[PDB]
Design a protein around this ligand. Structure first.
Ligand code: 1DF
Ligand code: 1DF
Ligand code: CL
Ligand code: CL
Ligand code: CL
Ligand code: CL
Ligand code: MN
Ligand code: MN
Lengths: 348, 352
């Protein structure tokens, strides 16, 4: 009943879809075994790489496939195209920079090969190693120029450091050079923040992911990244990591802090936070197959700035696709949401 | 002709009852300063109270003055914004950070008596919520009873964590037993995050009301829901401000991922609940719009929670803005719903 081909009036383009490489998962296992994994890696990957639960075992199998099985799963849910990225946390936590760069290179080449096999079904976002910003700049260019990628995904913090530090500037410089978006995908919080969430079972997708990622996007807005780089587009999933809902409070309290000189890293910005959401931030509904939240975000940010995403294989649910197809939205809005926003912002 | 007038007395068709309004006592602020000076203050106290107690900014200095008044200046400020009644609580973090239990109990007792005196003096304007010292849950239970029976209070406000500990721990159970005995709501108000969580927010200027408050408080409410507090205590009502600390917006993801975790037996701590998280929002959680004078968010939350479960709050004096009251008065919302929002929901849930 869910079919590819666009007969219902739009293609379904899923914009936050994950894969893994066996060798990178094996590094996570090595780090867990040797005690160099952070608490988030132990929690997240200690569970999915080892748990006998149905959910974990199917996730791992699906993550690792970039071929016929993935295509069959897409076909079964009417998903025409998937924008693919190496699953969080990528190579960001790795302590050996040579290893991180080598494995990122291999993951990027593996993804490029899969997109070359299925160029009408798979679209790639590159993975990088922000612990080396200039290498990451090189890899942004290589992905854009040689591999056919449409941007990059960064899995939030790198070893507890955030992208608003000047150190990471080459990444943004390069994204603006190639004119591609950055998708800031969640990760577990760093060890500096995770403990109260971890103890309650809240460190992952239920809560901690949104804390980490919303914080990361907010700190980039408030350091002025979009004044420095006015063309830059940053995408986030999960209905904007709560920021659209918080918007009134974000702007009120941001302004209060700026005027009162409360913080060194909070100085005047050229736009309000609302202004940046309307011009520089893009959101997907990954994990949020929920009409009132989607409509809220369309209203606040503009319906051109909200895109469909499935979050395969972490949230692979045929009934969610059906619920999205059935929303009380005009045909014209629905086609933007499922297809034409992604075509614009990813330059498909 | 639109007016700038904001009048007490209910002539718009409702009283304006503000449900998250703060005051301070000088002696408790002086303890914060002492803790900052002697190095026993946590990073959040240094950030928050180093700012309000010492900043020369216009905003901080006016806030500190207003916090300390429980009399004619506060009443005039309410009159000037058409606020008929204020539900008052000792400002975060209260006595929760204090290491000396005797000092915490003594200062909380004094703050509660000071509040009760003010409510007795202005009984049609001021309504009290008690402050407690969760470091001593059994004393706190006695103080919940004293507030309800002797002081005329309508519930208690707890300023989220106590020294890095959360209310889902069994240690704090006496507080819940007492709330159910007096049948009163708990307002979980924000605080700065504990030292175990604050660092990345603090460095960016995000530890306070802009962001970290919502992280801390939403986490705390979520922890309580997922430990099963409302299965243990089905009558218990927990109130939160700031449009539900994002939880209403996250609801689909909360329930989906809560279920995923329980079904995969991922966390020994996270076990089956009798209701969905959505179910608990509709039966056991209540929300105010403190800091969120914003129609789309209010309406969203009214749809998720039910219009009977969302109340007006000003967050005086941290967010004292006449234009916000005007915007709220003029929302495209039925008279009946608007009256619930401003007046009758609070009258029900606080038993006014
Ligand atoms: C490791 O990558 C993910 C993990 C989960 C999960 O543990 O359920 C969800 C998402 N997500 O974006 O929500 C992920 O991409
Ligand atoms: C110390 O108590 C508060 C502080 C602030 C602030 O720093 O602006 C905001 C709220 N509030 O609830 O948002 C307070 O109650
Ligand atoms: Cl009176
Ligand atoms: Cl701590
Ligand atoms: Cl009960
Ligand atoms: Cl399972
Ligand atoms: Mn994802
Ligand atoms: Mn408040």
């Amino acid at each position: 009943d869910l079919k590819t081909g666009g007969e219902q009036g739009y293609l379904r383009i899923a914009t936050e879809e994950a894969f893994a490489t066996r060798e990178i998962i094996d590094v996570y296992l090595r780090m867990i075994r040797d005690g160099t994994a952070d608490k988030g890696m132990v929690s997240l990957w200690g569970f999915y790489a080892q748990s006998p639960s149905e959910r974990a075992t199917q996730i791992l199998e699906r993550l690792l496939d970039l071929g016929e099985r993935r295509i069959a799963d897409m076909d079964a849910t009417g998903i025409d195209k998937a924008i693919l990225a190496l699953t969080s946390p990528g190579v960001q936590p790795l302590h050996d920079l040579d290893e991180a760069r080598t494995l990122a290179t291999r993951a990027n080449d593996t993804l490029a090969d899969a997109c070359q096999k299925y160029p009408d079904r798979f679209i790639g976002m590159g993975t990088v190693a922000p612990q080396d910003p200039e290498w990451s700049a090189r890899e942004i260019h290589r992905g854009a120029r040689e591999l056919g990628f449409k941007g990059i995904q960064i899995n939030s913090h790198t070893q507890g450091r955030y992208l608003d530090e000047e150190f990471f500037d080459p990444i943004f410089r390069a994204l603006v050079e190639v004119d591609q978006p950055l998708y800031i995908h969640p990760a577990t919080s760093p060890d500096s923040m995770i403990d109260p969430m971890l103890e309650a079972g809240l460190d992952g997708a239920i809560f901690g992911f949104g804390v980490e990622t919303g914080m990361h996007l907010l700190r980039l807005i408030t350091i002025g990244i979009f004044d420095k780089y006015p063309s830059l587009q940053i995408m986030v999933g999960h209905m904007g990591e709560a920021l659209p809902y918080w918007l009134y409070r974000l702007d009120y309290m941001h302004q209060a802090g700026v005027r009162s000189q409360r913080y060194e890293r909070m100085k005047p910005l050229k736009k309000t936070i609302e202004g940046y959401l309307k011009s520089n931030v893009l959101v997907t509904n990954s994990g949020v197959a929920w009409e009132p939240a989607i409509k809220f975000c369309q209203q606040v940010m503009g319906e051109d700035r909200v895109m469909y995403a499935m979050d395969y294989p972490y949230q692979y649910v045929a009934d969610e696709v059906r619920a999205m197809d059935a929303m009380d939205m005009s045909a014209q809005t629905k086609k933007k949401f499922f297809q034409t926003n992604a075509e614009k912002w990813f330059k498909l």
